[PDB]
Design a protein around this nucleic acid. Structure first.
Length: 183
DNA sequence: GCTATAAGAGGGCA
DNA sequence: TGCCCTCTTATAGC
């Protein structure tokens, strides 16, 4: 399952759910101390909980975005709590169409990488402009995932809606990273 | 903090 | 249209 012997650590999960009822954002920002509401800056009530440590963006439409969780289960668990906070605030909040929208993972191959050489041999997938951003942007097509590769051997993998895409994307890149190890 | 990456949701504007 | 608005998170050089 993990031939490299390295398993990317999940760092951030973004999920969405439909509370299925219109929400009064001022009433929420007023009643719940946990919330922040700034209409002129952003159309959402920003609310946070300690466990699982997450941040929710709550919209008048009843739609909700949940960010910050370390796993898919934690994200859904956090979403459910926010849904309950809203219910208790006096809204008929449900939990419709919960969905994991993005998974961000990271790992360390423990060896430096020759980024320019990797970029050159994979021009169609790479974007490496160190003066702009020190990491190489690798847009993997299968699976459709974006990896940020640094000289240190540290790797960020983002864009996955399923964790196996994070894993597979890493496994695909591993042999390439090795080929371009900095001696 | 800023630079870059993915993804969601919405109001607002060119 | 079509993108920025906000927010999260790892990464690292500014």
């Amino acid at each position: 399952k993990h031939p490299s012997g390295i398993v990317p650590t999940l760092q951030n999960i973004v999920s969405t759910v439909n509370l299925d009822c219109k929400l009064d954002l001022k009433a929420i920002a007023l009643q719940a101390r946990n919330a922040e509401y700034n209409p002129k800056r952003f159309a959402a009530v920003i609310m946070r909980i300690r466990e699982p440590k997450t941040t929710a963006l709550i919209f008048a439409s009843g739609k909700m975005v949940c960010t910050g969780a370390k796993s898919e289960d934690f994200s859904k668990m956090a979403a459910r709590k926010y849904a309950r906070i809203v219910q208790k605030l006096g809204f008929p909040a449900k939990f419709k169409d919960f969905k994991i929208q993005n998974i961000v993972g990271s790992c360390d191959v423990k060896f430096p990488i020759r980024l320019e050489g990797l970029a050159y041999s994979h021009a169609a997938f790479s974007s490496y402009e160190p003066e702009l951003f020190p990491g190489l942007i690798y847009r993997m097509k299968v699976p459709k995932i974006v990896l940020l590769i640094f000289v240190s051997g540290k790797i960020v993998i983002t864009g996955a809606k399923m964790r196996d895409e994070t894993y597979k994307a890493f496994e695909n890149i591993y042999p390439v990273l090795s080929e371009f190890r900095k001696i």
